[PDB]
């Protein structure tokens, strides 16, 4: 389940911050899973339930007075802001990043991994506050790409002098 | 570049065997956000969606077809490849790969498409359509498409030609729109669940096979309708 840099995101692609590395999709298809990237549905009723329609989120009925349909977030978590994170993470403010769970302490717990530029501070309850460096470790085989810091995470970009097709991801 | 497509297949195979084919991408990289599709006709039937790969792995399958069905991307040829187990006669058909368009804005966008490969069998549709539409010469004449919300209501409608003999072309994208080379006097219109195509000043050269197209959300995949002979009278 751990996310590697082996790991290959179906239909997406790797991203790293300052202390794990997840699953990005492409277009505006949505996670089912931590490595999983599938199209969303846009309307939730009583056809396209149990079908995603966002980040680790699907489409539920809601019994009542009347039967509703809803987008509500899978087993494990829970909606914040409209965002479905780790239960472990509920109300957990990391500054320059983000709550995870810890598979280096397999006991679930909610740590902070942080914007590449800033590493955990031991000073500040362990949040992103003091700046700090990460060392990238994706491997961007394809042709003319290479690891690059993009708004705040390393991710797999067009090398120097070449830029990304929008409709086919291919660096031109 | 130019992306063009050709499927490889054999052109008899026996009951019970394994159905091979291989479609070959060239001008262009199989390693791109692309699904890639393979889609089947019977001889004289509609357009029936088989699968898709991306070249991550992921596929997606027809759940009629899921048991019997694998799809297998090789990125370092550029080729992806379909297998179908149990063949029966009911699985003699055209079978064509295309390139299909990926989220909401393009699920459903099919093009290119290949010649198609004819696959004989030896011995041993979701959308609605009227199965036929005629006029004559100079005549506006309508082709229906019925759909369901899970379909027409919350994707895009495309709308697919076939010249006889030749494969599905891109007709019209994004419910209303026309890719370039296709003249004004064909137009579109969705409405709810049903969808529609006027072709005005109707003339010999529209002779031909239209398709009505959308991802089905309660699916999970494309579907085409069964489609509409368009005849014109009069003509050669």
């Known amino acids: 389940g751990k996310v590697t840099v082996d790991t290959v995101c179906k239909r997406g692609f790797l991203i790293q911050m300052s202390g794990h590395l997840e699953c990005k999709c492409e277009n505006d298809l949505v996670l089912v899973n931590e490595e999983t990237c599938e199209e969303k549905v846009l309307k939730c009723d009583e056809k396209t339930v149990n079908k995603p329609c966002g980040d680790f989120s699907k489409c539920i009925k809601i019994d009542g007075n009347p039967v509703s349909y809803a987008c509500k977030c899978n087993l494990g978590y829970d909606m914040v802001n409209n965002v479905c994170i780790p239960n472990e993470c509920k109300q957990v403010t990391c500054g320059n990043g983000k709550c995870i769970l810890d598979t280096s302490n397999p006991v679930k717990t909610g740590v902070c991994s942080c914007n590449i530029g800033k590493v955990p501070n031991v000073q500040d309850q362990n949040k992103c506050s003091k700046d700090g460096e990460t060392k990238c470790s994706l491997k961007c085989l394809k042709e003319q790409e290479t690891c690059k810091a993009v708004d705040g995470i390393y991710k797999c970009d067009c090398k120097d002098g070449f830029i990304i097709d929008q409709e086919s991801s291919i660096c031109t | ?236």
């Open chain 2, 1 to 236: 570049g130019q992306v063009q497509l050709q499927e490889s297949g054999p052109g008899l195979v026996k009951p019970s065997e394994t159905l091979s084919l291989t479609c070959t991408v060239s001008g262009f990289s199989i390693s791109s956000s692309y699904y890639w599709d393979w889609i089947r006709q019977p001889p004289g039937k509609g357009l029936e969606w088989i699968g898709n790969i991306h070249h991550t792995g992921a596929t997606y399958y027809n759940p009629s077809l899921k048991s019997r069905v694998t799809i297998s991307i090789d990125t370092a040829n550029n080729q992806f490849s379909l297998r179908l187990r149990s063949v029966t006669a009911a699985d003699a058909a055209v079978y064509y790969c295309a390139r299909g368009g990926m989220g909401t804005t393009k699920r459903g966008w099919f093009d290119p498409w290949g010649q198609g490969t004819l696959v004989t069998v030896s011995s041993g549709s979701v959308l609605t359509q009227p199965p036929s539409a005629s006029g004559t010469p100079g005549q506006r004449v309508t082709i229906s498409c019925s759909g369901s919300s899970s379909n027409i209501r919350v994707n895009y409608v495309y709308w697919y030609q076939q010249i006889p003999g030749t494969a599905p072309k891109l007709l019209i994208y994004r419910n209303d729109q026309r890719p370039s080379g296709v003249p004004d006097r064909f137009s579109a219109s969705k409405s709810g669940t049903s969808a529609s195509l006027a072709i005005s000043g109707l003339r010999s050269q529209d002779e031909a096979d239209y398709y009505c197209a959308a991802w089905d959300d309660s699916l999970t995949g494309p579907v085409f309708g069964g489609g509409t002979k368009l005849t014109v009278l009069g003509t050669k």
